């Protein structure tokens, strides 16, 4: 665990770290924001933020503008990378697959089975590292964008007792039924689509147990050029209304898929999570 | 004038444009944020933002997080480039000179005198263009960071009656007495140091007329690596005191030279300028 950068922002501190990840079998870099006053005697809750295709930890920390409200609500923020990295990790030219595009699953197909275990990384390895080295409690929530939105809602659904709430921006709610997901699932999981269902939010919500329901918020711009071919938000809503799941999906008129969009409603999400984090 | 990008943010709109600039004799790109409600029948005041070395219009728009408060206060933001651009425009690898480093002056030394007229650009051409194609009024304020901070205070002091207020983040207040200024002024203005004074905030403030005094706010992080070698805020504090100039310079403990610092207090500056812009 090595601190590679540190900067003050909104009374708090933004810091990047690197560490030899066991789940990804490679060096991983993640960013952490500690609100003002966070200490071993005053531990704070945590919001995990998963980014989308081609992103790293820096995109959100630099363009979301989440610090102001996070400092105010006393919420720490951990932003992990989107995949394993390095010349010893497989990769291909496409931006929508392999490095920079882990889809937060545990690849079973070789050669991706070795390092592409972003699921275990985000769900087990990182949280353990965070709670052991930072002034934070075990109370946590999760959110993300696009591929990361898919990750947040999917991970929440699969770990109902470990997250108090979940949200997402422009999420890929039904990977099984979109090019990005089909490609990602085929390469990482194989052609047996029955193994895909365990990583699809729509499939997961449908089989969800009422007692494990948890507060969910989703923001989506109706000017998102990926709205119909990859995102398909209505697919999740339909399932949510079948299960009476506590999901709130809001279309924001005129907004797109960029961080200008994320920054426009990140505060709504922080307030949303704060309610359950505390 | 050609619009090259458009995105919605905080209810308003962020847009980038290019045009054939006369002053710089080259195509120039700038960005504009119109708060929600801005229209021909409802025009709004403008805050010009001057960026520092190596920056363009995007750094501030993407990393400052100024839209929430600007949209709330009804303030339009114009962020021009930092110098002329193009393969036919003089340039060199140095990050502190030539392109991305116009220092907001009108170059007198060839070959720079042809395109390096950022003073003329930001002060005369740009405002005329903005007020001609956008739902903005004539009321304006100006701010900036580092080289842009130098630009903001300098431009305001040189045109006391055309700007209602001025502010800056980590400004180069005394370019004549720092490496960045010496190098830039020597290349752009020549060896005769007497021609540099007209672009130095400390020299300028020293000769300000009482009735032309205007509100000024400067924010400087005390952990800024360029503080003592390039910025020297106290040099300006001294002049301001001798002239009873209404300058308030605050040292922000623990903050650096980055946009993390800027994003931390941009709201304070917006509120600052709002008072005079309305
Ligand atoms: Cl692998
Ligand atoms: Cl030139």
Coordinates of C-alpha atoms and ligand atoms in Angstrom, one line a residue:
Chain A
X1 CA 0.0 0.0 0.0
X2 CA 1.7 3.1 -1.3
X3 CA 0.4 6.7 -1.2
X4 CA 1.3 8.2 -4.6
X5 CA -0.6 11.5 -4.4
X6 CA -2.4 13.7 -2.0
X7 CA -4.2 17.0 -2.3
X8 CA -6.6 19.1 -0.2
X9 CA -10.0 19.8 -1.5
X10 CA -13.1 21.2 0.2
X11 CA -11.5 20.9 3.7
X12 CA -10.9 17.2 3.1
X13 CA -8.2 15.2 1.4
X14 CA -8.0 13.4 -2.0
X15 CA -5.3 10.7 -2.2
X16 CA -4.3 8.1 -4.7
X17 CA -2.7 4.8 -3.7
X18 CA -1.3 1.7 -5.4
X19 CA -1.1 -1.8 -4.0
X20 CA -0.4 -5.4 -5.2
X21 CA -3.9 -6.7 -5.6
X22 CA -4.4 -10.4 -4.9
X23 CA -7.7 -10.7 -6.7
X24 CA -6.4 -9.2 -9.9
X25 CA -2.8 -10.5 -9.6
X26 CA -1.4 -7.0 -10.4
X27 CA -0.7 -3.6 -9.1
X28 CA -4.0 -1.6 -8.7
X29 CA -4.5 2.1 -8.2
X30 CA -7.4 3.6 -6.4
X31 CA -8.5 7.0 -5.1
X32 CA -9.9 7.9 -1.7
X33 CA -11.5 11.1 -0.4
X34 CA -11.7 11.6 3.3
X35 CA -14.1 14.3 4.5
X36 CA -12.9 17.0 6.9
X37 CA -12.4 15.7 10.5
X38 CA -12.2 12.0 9.6
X39 CA -10.0 10.3 12.1
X40 CA -9.5 7.0 14.0
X41 CA -11.6 8.6 16.8
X42 CA -14.2 9.9 14.3
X43 CA -14.6 7.2 11.6
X44 CA -16.9 8.0 8.7
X45 CA -19.1 5.9 6.4
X46 CA -18.1 5.1 2.8
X47 CA -19.5 5.4 -0.7
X48 CA -17.9 3.2 -3.3
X49 CA -17.9 4.7 -6.8
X50 CA -17.4 2.4 -9.9
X51 CA -16.5 4.1 -13.2
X52 CA -17.2 3.1 -16.7
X53 CA -15.4 2.0 -19.9
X54 CA -11.9 3.3 -20.4
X55 CA -12.0 5.2 -17.0
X56 CA -9.7 5.1 -14.0
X57 CA -10.1 6.6 -10.6
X58 CA -9.2 10.1 -11.8
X59 CA -12.3 10.8 -14.0
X60 CA -14.8 10.9 -11.2
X61 CA -12.5 12.6 -8.7
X62 CA -11.6 15.3 -11.2
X63 CA -14.9 15.9 -13.0
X64 CA -17.7 14.8 -10.7
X65 CA -17.4 17.7 -8.2
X66 CA -18.6 15.4 -5.4
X67 CA -16.2 16.7 -2.7
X68 CA -18.2 19.8 -1.7
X69 CA -21.3 17.9 -0.7
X70 CA -19.4 14.8 0.5
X71 CA -17.4 17.0 2.9
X72 CA -20.6 18.5 4.1
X73 CA -22.3 15.1 4.7
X74 CA -19.2 13.6 6.2
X75 CA -18.9 10.8 3.6
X76 CA -15.7 9.2 2.5
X77 CA -15.4 8.1 -1.2
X78 CA -13.4 5.3 -2.6
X79 CA -13.0 5.1 -6.4
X80 CA -11.3 2.0 -7.7
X81 CA -9.9 1.3 -11.2
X82 CA -12.1 -0.4 -13.8
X83 CA -9.9 -3.4 -14.5
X84 CA -6.5 -5.0 -13.9
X85 CA -3.7 -3.2 -15.7
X86 CA -0.2 -4.0 -17.1
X87 CA 1.7 -5.7 -19.8
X88 CA 1.3 -9.0 -17.9
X89 CA -2.5 -8.7 -18.1
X90 CA -4.3 -9.6 -21.3
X91 CA -5.7 -6.8 -23.4
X92 CA -7.0 -6.0 -26.9
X93 CA -7.5 -2.9 -29.0
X94 CA -11.2 -2.5 -28.4
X95 CA -12.2 0.1 -25.8
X96 CA -15.3 -1.9 -24.8
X97 CA -13.4 -5.0 -23.6
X98 CA -10.5 -6.2 -21.5
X99 CA -8.3 -3.5 -19.8
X100 CA -10.4 -0.5 -18.9
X101 CA -13.5 -2.7 -19.2
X102 CA -13.7 -5.4 -16.6
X103 CA -17.5 -5.2 -16.2
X104 CA -17.1 -6.0 -12.5
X105 CA -17.3 -9.7 -12.9
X106 CA -14.9 -12.7 -12.2
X107 CA -13.9 -14.0 -15.6
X108 CA -14.0 -17.8 -15.8
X109 CA -12.7 -18.0 -19.4
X110 CA -9.0 -18.1 -20.0
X111 CA -6.9 -16.0 -20.5
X112 CA -9.1 -13.5 -18.5
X113 CA -9.7 -15.8 -15.5
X114 CA -6.3 -14.8 -13.9
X115 CA -6.6 -11.0 -13.6
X116 CA -10.2 -10.1 -14.5
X117 CA -11.8 -10.5 -11.1
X118 CA -13.0 -6.9 -10.5
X119 CA -16.0 -8.4 -8.8
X120 CA -14.0 -9.9 -5.9
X121 CA -11.7 -6.9 -6.0
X122 CA -14.5 -4.4 -5.5
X123 CA -16.7 -6.6 -3.2
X124 CA -14.1 -8.2 -1.0
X125 CA -10.4 -7.2 -1.4
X126 CA -10.7 -3.4 -1.6
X127 CA -13.3 -2.9 1.2
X128 CA -11.1 -5.0 3.5
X129 CA -8.1 -2.9 2.7
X130 CA -10.0 0.4 3.1
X131 CA -11.5 -0.4 6.5
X132 CA -8.1 -1.7 7.8
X133 CA -6.1 1.4 6.8
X134 CA -8.5 4.3 6.7
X135 CA -10.6 6.2 9.3
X136 CA -13.8 4.6 8.1
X137 CA -16.6 2.3 9.5
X138 CA -18.0 -0.8 7.9
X139 CA -21.2 1.0 6.8
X140 CA -21.1 1.4 3.0
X141 CA -23.1 2.2 -0.1
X142 CA -22.3 1.9 -3.8
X143 CA -22.8 3.9 -7.0
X144 CA -21.3 4.1 -10.5
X145 CA -21.5 5.2 -14.1
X146 CA -22.5 3.1 -17.2
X147 CA -20.5 -0.1 -16.8
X148 CA -19.9 1.1 -13.3
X149 CA -23.6 1.7 -12.8
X150 CA -24.2 -1.9 -13.9
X151 CA -21.6 -2.9 -11.3
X152 CA -23.1 -0.9 -8.4
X153 CA -26.7 -2.2 -8.8
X154 CA -25.5 -5.7 -9.6
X155 CA -23.1 -5.9 -6.6
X156 CA -25.8 -4.4 -4.3
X157 CA -28.4 -7.0 -5.4
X158 CA -25.9 -9.8 -4.9
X159 CA -24.8 -8.5 -1.4
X160 CA -28.1 -7.1 0.1
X161 CA -26.8 -7.2 3.7
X162 CA -23.5 -5.5 3.0
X163 CA -24.6 -2.3 1.4
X164 CA -27.2 0.1 2.8
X165 CA -28.1 1.6 -0.5
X166 CA -27.2 1.8 -4.2
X167 CA -27.5 4.2 -7.1
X168 CA -26.2 4.6 -10.7
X169 CA -25.8 7.0 -13.6
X170 CA -26.6 5.8 -17.1
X171 CA -26.4 2.2 -16.0
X172 CA -26.3 -0.9 -18.3
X173 CA -29.2 -2.5 -16.6
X174 CA -29.6 -5.5 -18.8
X175 CA -26.1 -6.5 -20.1
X176 CA -27.5 -9.9 -21.4
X177 CA -29.5 -7.9 -23.9
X178 CA -27.0 -5.4 -25.3
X179 CA -23.8 -5.5 -27.4
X180 CA -21.5 -4.3 -24.7
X181 CA -22.7 -7.0 -22.3
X182 CA -22.9 -9.8 -24.8
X183 CA -19.3 -9.2 -25.9
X184 CA -18.1 -8.8 -22.3
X185 CA -20.0 -11.9 -21.0
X186 CA -18.9 -14.0 -24.0
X187 CA -15.3 -13.2 -23.6
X188 CA -15.2 -13.4 -19.8
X189 CA -17.8 -16.0 -19.1
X190 CA -18.1 -18.1 -22.2
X191 CA -21.0 -19.0 -24.6
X192 CA -23.1 -20.6 -21.9
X193 CA -25.5 -17.7 -21.2
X194 CA -26.9 -19.4 -18.1
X195 CA -23.7 -18.2 -16.3
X196 CA -24.4 -14.6 -17.4
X197 CA -27.6 -14.3 -15.5
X198 CA -25.7 -14.0 -12.2
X199 CA -24.2 -10.7 -13.3
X200 CA -27.3 -9.1 -14.9
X201 CA -29.2 -6.6 -12.8
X202 CA -32.5 -7.3 -14.4
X203 CA -32.2 -11.0 -13.8
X204 CA -30.9 -10.4 -10.3
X205 CA -33.7 -8.1 -9.3
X206 CA -36.4 -10.5 -10.6
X207 CA -35.2 -13.2 -8.2
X208 CA -34.6 -10.8 -5.4
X209 CA -36.3 -11.5 -2.0
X210 CA -38.5 -8.8 -0.6
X211 CA -36.7 -8.9 2.8
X212 CA -33.4 -8.1 1.0
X213 CA -34.8 -5.1 -0.9
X214 CA -32.7 -2.0 -0.5
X215 CA -33.1 1.7 -1.6
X216 CA -32.1 2.3 -5.2
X217 CA -31.7 5.5 -7.3
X218 CA -30.9 5.8 -11.0
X219 CA -30.4 8.9 -13.0
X220 CA -30.5 8.8 -16.8
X221 CA -30.3 11.6 -19.4
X222 CA -32.7 11.2 -22.3
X223 CA -30.0 12.6 -24.6
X224 CA -27.6 9.8 -23.8
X225 CA -26.5 8.5 -27.2
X226 CA -26.2 5.0 -25.7
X227 CA -29.7 5.1 -24.2
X228 CA -31.4 2.6 -26.5
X229 CA -28.6 0.3 -27.7
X230 CA -26.8 -0.3 -24.4
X231 CA -28.5 1.2 -21.4
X232 CA -32.2 0.3 -21.8
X233 CA -33.4 1.7 -18.4
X234 CA -37.0 0.7 -18.9
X235 CA -35.9 -3.0 -18.7
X236 CA -35.0 -2.5 -15.0
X237 CA -38.1 -0.4 -14.2
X238 CA -40.4 -3.1 -15.6
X239 CA -38.7 -5.7 -13.3
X240 CA -38.8 -3.3 -10.4
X241 CA -42.5 -2.9 -10.7
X242 CA -43.1 -6.6 -10.9
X243 CA -41.2 -7.0 -7.6
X244 CA -42.4 -3.8 -6.0
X245 CA -38.6 -3.2 -5.6
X246 CA -37.7 0.2 -4.0
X247 CA -36.1 1.6 -7.2
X248 CA -36.5 5.1 -8.4
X249 CA -35.4 5.8 -12.0
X250 CA -35.4 9.4 -13.2
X251 CA -35.0 10.5 -16.8
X252 CA -33.3 13.9 -16.9
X253 CA -34.3 15.8 -20.0
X254 CA -31.5 17.0 -22.3
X255 CA -28.6 15.4 -20.4
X256 CA -26.1 13.0 -21.9
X257 CA -23.6 10.3 -20.9
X258 CA -20.8 12.6 -19.8
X259 CA -19.5 13.7 -16.4
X260 CA -21.2 17.1 -16.9
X261 CA -24.3 15.0 -16.4
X262 CA -22.9 13.1 -13.4
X263 CA -21.8 16.4 -11.8
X264 CA -25.3 17.7 -12.3
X265 CA -26.9 15.2 -10.0
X266 CA -24.1 13.7 -7.9
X267 CA -25.2 15.8 -4.9
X268 CA -28.7 14.3 -5.1
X269 CA -27.1 10.9 -4.9
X270 CA -24.9 11.8 -2.0
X271 CA -27.9 13.1 0.0
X272 CA -29.7 9.9 -1.0
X273 CA -27.0 7.7 0.3
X274 CA -26.3 9.8 3.4
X275 CA -29.8 9.0 4.6
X276 CA -29.0 5.3 4.8
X277 CA -25.3 5.6 5.6
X278 CA -26.3 7.3 8.8
Chain B
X1 CA -18.6 31.5 -35.3
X2 CA -19.1 27.8 -35.2
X3 CA -20.4 25.7 -32.4
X4 CA -18.4 22.5 -32.0
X5 CA -19.8 20.9 -28.8
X6 CA -22.9 21.3 -26.6
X7 CA -23.8 19.6 -23.3
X8 CA -26.3 20.2 -20.5
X9 CA -25.0 20.8 -17.0
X10 CA -26.8 22.1 -13.8
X11 CA -29.8 23.1 -15.8
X12 CA -27.8 25.4 -18.1
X13 CA -25.7 24.7 -21.2
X14 CA -22.0 24.3 -21.8
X15 CA -20.9 25.0 -25.3
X16 CA -17.6 25.3 -27.2
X17 CA -17.1 27.4 -30.3
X18 CA -14.3 28.3 -32.7
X19 CA -14.0 31.3 -34.9
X20 CA -11.5 33.2 -37.0
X21 CA -10.0 35.7 -34.6
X22 CA -8.7 38.9 -36.0
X23 CA -6.5 39.9 -33.1
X24 CA -4.7 36.6 -33.0
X25 CA -4.8 36.0 -36.8
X26 CA -5.8 32.4 -36.2
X27 CA -8.8 30.1 -35.4
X28 CA -9.6 30.2 -31.7
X29 CA -11.6 28.0 -29.5
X30 CA -13.5 29.1 -26.4
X31 CA -16.3 27.8 -24.1
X32 CA -19.4 29.3 -22.7
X33 CA -21.8 28.4 -19.9
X34 CA -25.2 29.9 -20.0
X35 CA -27.2 29.4 -16.8
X36 CA -30.8 28.2 -16.9
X37 CA -33.2 30.8 -18.1
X38 CA -30.7 32.8 -20.2
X39 CA -32.4 34.1 -23.4
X40 CA -32.8 37.1 -25.7
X41 CA -35.6 38.2 -23.5
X42 CA -33.7 37.4 -20.3
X43 CA -30.0 38.2 -20.7
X44 CA -27.4 37.6 -18.0
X45 CA -24.1 39.1 -16.7
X46 CA -20.8 37.4 -17.6
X47 CA -17.7 36.3 -15.7
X48 CA -14.6 35.9 -17.8
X49 CA -12.3 33.2 -16.7
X50 CA -8.6 33.3 -17.8
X51 CA -6.7 30.0 -17.5
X52 CA -3.0 29.4 -16.8
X53 CA 0.0 27.8 -18.5
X54 CA -0.7 24.8 -20.8
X55 CA -4.5 25.1 -20.3
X56 CA -7.2 25.6 -22.8
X57 CA -10.9 26.3 -22.1
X58 CA -11.7 22.7 -21.0
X59 CA -9.6 22.5 -17.8
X60 CA -11.8 25.0 -15.9
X61 CA -15.1 23.8 -17.4
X62 CA -14.4 20.2 -16.6
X63 CA -12.5 20.5 -13.2
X64 CA -13.6 23.7 -11.5
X65 CA -17.2 22.6 -10.8
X66 CA -18.5 26.1 -11.2
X67 CA -21.8 25.3 -12.8
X68 CA -24.0 24.6 -9.8
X69 CA -23.4 28.0 -8.2
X70 CA -23.2 29.9 -11.5
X71 CA -26.5 28.4 -12.6
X72 CA -28.0 29.3 -9.2
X73 CA -26.8 32.9 -9.3
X74 CA -27.6 33.4 -13.0
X75 CA -24.1 33.9 -14.2
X76 CA -22.7 33.2 -17.6
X77 CA -19.1 32.0 -17.8
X78 CA -16.8 32.6 -20.8
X79 CA -13.5 30.7 -20.8
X80 CA -11.1 31.6 -23.7
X81 CA -8.0 29.8 -24.7
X82 CA -4.6 30.8 -23.3
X83 CA -2.9 31.7 -26.6
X84 CA -3.2 31.5 -30.4
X85 CA -3.1 28.0 -31.9
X86 CA -2.0 26.4 -35.2
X87 CA 1.0 24.9 -36.9
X88 CA 1.5 28.3 -38.6
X89 CA 1.8 30.0 -35.1
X90 CA 5.2 30.2 -33.5
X91 CA 5.8 27.5 -30.8
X92 CA 8.4 25.6 -28.9
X93 CA 8.4 22.7 -26.4
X94 CA 8.7 25.0 -23.3
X95 CA 5.5 24.8 -21.3
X96 CA 6.0 28.3 -20.0
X97 CA 6.3 30.1 -23.4
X98 CA 4.7 30.4 -26.8
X99 CA 1.5 28.3 -27.2
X100 CA -0.5 27.7 -24.1
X101 CA 1.4 30.6 -22.5
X102 CA 0.4 33.9 -24.1
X103 CA 0.5 35.7 -20.8
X104 CA -2.4 37.9 -21.9
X105 CA -0.1 40.6 -23.5
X106 CA 0.2 42.0 -27.0
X107 CA 3.6 40.9 -28.3
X108 CA 5.8 43.5 -29.9
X109 CA 8.7 41.2 -30.9
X110 CA 8.6 39.3 -34.2
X111 CA 7.5 36.7 -35.0
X112 CA 5.2 36.6 -31.9
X113 CA 3.6 40.0 -32.6
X114 CA 1.6 38.4 -35.3
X115 CA -0.5 35.9 -33.3
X116 CA 0.3 36.6 -29.7
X117 CA -2.2 39.4 -29.0
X118 CA -4.2 37.7 -26.2
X119 CA -4.6 41.0 -24.4
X120 CA -6.4 42.4 -27.5
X121 CA -8.2 39.1 -27.8
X122 CA -9.6 38.8 -24.3
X123 CA -10.1 42.5 -23.7
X124 CA -11.6 43.8 -27.0
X125 CA -12.4 41.1 -29.6
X126 CA -13.9 38.3 -27.4
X127 CA -16.3 40.5 -25.3
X128 CA -17.6 42.1 -28.5
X129 CA -18.1 38.6 -30.1
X130 CA -19.8 37.2 -26.9
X131 CA -22.2 40.1 -26.5
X132 CA -23.1 39.8 -30.1
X133 CA -24.0 36.1 -30.4
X134 CA -25.1 35.3 -26.8
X135 CA -28.0 36.2 -24.4
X136 CA -25.6 38.2 -22.2
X137 CA -25.6 41.8 -21.0
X138 CA -22.7 44.2 -21.0
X139 CA -22.1 43.8 -17.3
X140 CA -19.0 41.7 -16.6
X141 CA -16.4 40.6 -14.1
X142 CA -13.1 38.8 -14.6
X143 CA -11.1 36.1 -12.7
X144 CA -8.4 33.5 -13.5
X145 CA -5.8 31.2 -12.2
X146 CA -2.0 31.7 -12.1
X147 CA -1.0 33.2 -15.5
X148 CA -4.7 33.8 -15.8
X149 CA -4.8 35.3 -12.4
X150 CA -2.1 37.7 -13.6
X151 CA -4.3 38.3 -16.6
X152 CA -7.5 39.0 -14.6
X153 CA -6.1 41.5 -12.2
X154 CA -4.0 43.2 -14.9
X155 CA -7.0 43.5 -17.3
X156 CA -9.3 44.8 -14.6
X157 CA -6.7 47.4 -13.5
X158 CA -6.2 48.5 -17.1
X159 CA -9.9 48.8 -17.7
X160 CA -11.4 49.9 -14.3
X161 CA -14.6 51.2 -15.8
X162 CA -15.4 48.1 -17.9
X163 CA -15.3 45.4 -15.2
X164 CA -17.4 45.6 -12.0
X165 CA -15.0 43.4 -10.0
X166 CA -11.9 41.1 -10.3
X167 CA -10.5 38.0 -8.5
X168 CA -7.8 35.4 -8.9
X169 CA -6.4 32.0 -7.8
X170 CA -2.7 31.7 -7.3
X171 CA -2.0 34.7 -9.5
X172 CA 1.4 35.8 -10.8
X173 CA 1.0 39.3 -9.2
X174 CA 4.5 40.6 -10.0
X175 CA 5.6 39.0 -13.4
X176 CA 8.5 41.4 -13.6
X177 CA 10.1 39.8 -10.6
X178 CA 9.7 36.1 -11.3
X179 CA 11.2 33.6 -13.8
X180 CA 7.9 33.0 -15.6
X181 CA 7.4 36.7 -16.2
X182 CA 11.0 37.4 -17.2
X183 CA 11.1 34.7 -19.8
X184 CA 7.7 35.5 -21.2
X185 CA 8.2 39.3 -21.2
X186 CA 11.7 39.0 -22.8
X187 CA 10.5 36.9 -25.7
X188 CA 7.2 38.8 -26.2
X189 CA 8.1 42.3 -25.3
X190 CA 11.9 42.5 -25.7
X191 CA 14.8 43.4 -23.4
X192 CA 13.5 46.9 -22.6
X193 CA 12.0 46.3 -19.1
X194 CA 10.2 49.6 -19.1
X195 CA 7.7 48.1 -21.6
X196 CA 6.9 45.3 -19.1
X197 CA 5.4 47.6 -16.4
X198 CA 2.1 48.0 -18.4
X199 CA 1.4 44.3 -17.9
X200 CA 2.5 44.0 -14.2
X201 CA -0.3 44.1 -11.6
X202 CA 1.9 45.5 -8.9
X203 CA 3.2 48.3 -11.2
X204 CA -0.4 48.9 -12.4
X205 CA -2.0 49.0 -9.0
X206 CA 0.6 51.4 -7.8
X207 CA -0.7 53.9 -10.4
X208 CA -4.4 53.3 -10.0
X209 CA -6.8 56.3 -9.6
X210 CA -8.9 56.4 -6.5
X211 CA -12.2 56.7 -8.3
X212 CA -11.3 53.7 -10.4
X213 CA -10.7 51.3 -7.5
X214 CA -12.7 48.1 -7.8
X215 CA -13.4 45.1 -5.5
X216 CA -10.7 42.4 -5.6
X217 CA -10.4 39.0 -4.1
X218 CA -7.4 36.7 -4.3
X219 CA -7.1 33.2 -3.0
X220 CA -3.7 31.5 -2.5
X221 CA -3.0 28.1 -1.1
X222 CA 0.0 28.1 1.2
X223 CA 1.1 24.7 -0.1
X224 CA 1.4 26.0 -3.6
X225 CA 4.8 24.8 -5.0
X226 CA 5.1 28.0 -7.1
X227 CA 4.2 30.4 -4.2
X228 CA 7.6 31.9 -3.4
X229 CA 9.3 31.6 -6.8
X230 CA 6.5 32.7 -9.2
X231 CA 3.5 34.0 -7.4
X232 CA 4.7 36.2 -4.5
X233 CA 1.2 37.4 -3.4
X234 CA 2.6 39.6 -0.6
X235 CA 4.2 41.8 -3.3
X236 CA 0.7 42.9 -4.3
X237 CA -0.5 43.1 -0.8
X238 CA 2.2 45.8 -0.2
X239 CA 1.1 47.9 -3.1
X240 CA -2.6 47.6 -2.2
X241 CA -1.8 48.8 1.3
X242 CA 0.1 51.9 0.1
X243 CA -2.8 52.7 -2.2
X244 CA -5.6 51.8 0.1
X245 CA -6.7 49.5 -2.7
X246 CA -9.8 47.3 -1.8
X247 CA -7.9 44.1 -2.3
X248 CA -8.5 41.1 0.0
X249 CA -5.9 38.4 -0.3
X250 CA -6.5 35.2 1.7
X251 CA -4.0 32.4 2.2
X252 CA -5.8 29.0 2.2
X253 CA -3.8 26.7 4.4
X254 CA -3.0 23.3 3.1
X255 CA -4.2 23.9 -0.5
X256 CA -2.1 23.6 -3.6
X257 CA -1.9 25.0 -7.2
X258 CA -4.4 22.6 -8.7
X259 CA -8.0 22.7 -9.8
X260 CA -8.8 20.8 -6.6
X261 CA -7.9 24.1 -4.9
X262 CA -9.8 26.2 -7.4
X263 CA -13.0 24.0 -7.2
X264 CA -12.8 24.4 -3.4
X265 CA -13.4 28.2 -3.5
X266 CA -14.8 29.0 -6.9
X267 CA -18.2 29.3 -5.2
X268 CA -16.8 32.0 -2.9
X269 CA -15.6 33.9 -5.9
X270 CA -18.9 33.5 -7.8
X271 CA -20.8 34.9 -4.7
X272 CA -18.1 37.6 -4.6
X273 CA -18.7 38.7 -8.2
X274 CA -22.4 38.2 -8.0
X275 CA -22.6 41.2 -5.6
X276 CA -21.1 43.5 -8.1
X277 CA -22.6 41.9 -11.2
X278 CA -26.2 42.6 -10.0
Ligands
LIG1 CL1 -6.3 -12.4 -16.9
LIG2 CL1 2.9 35.2 -33.9

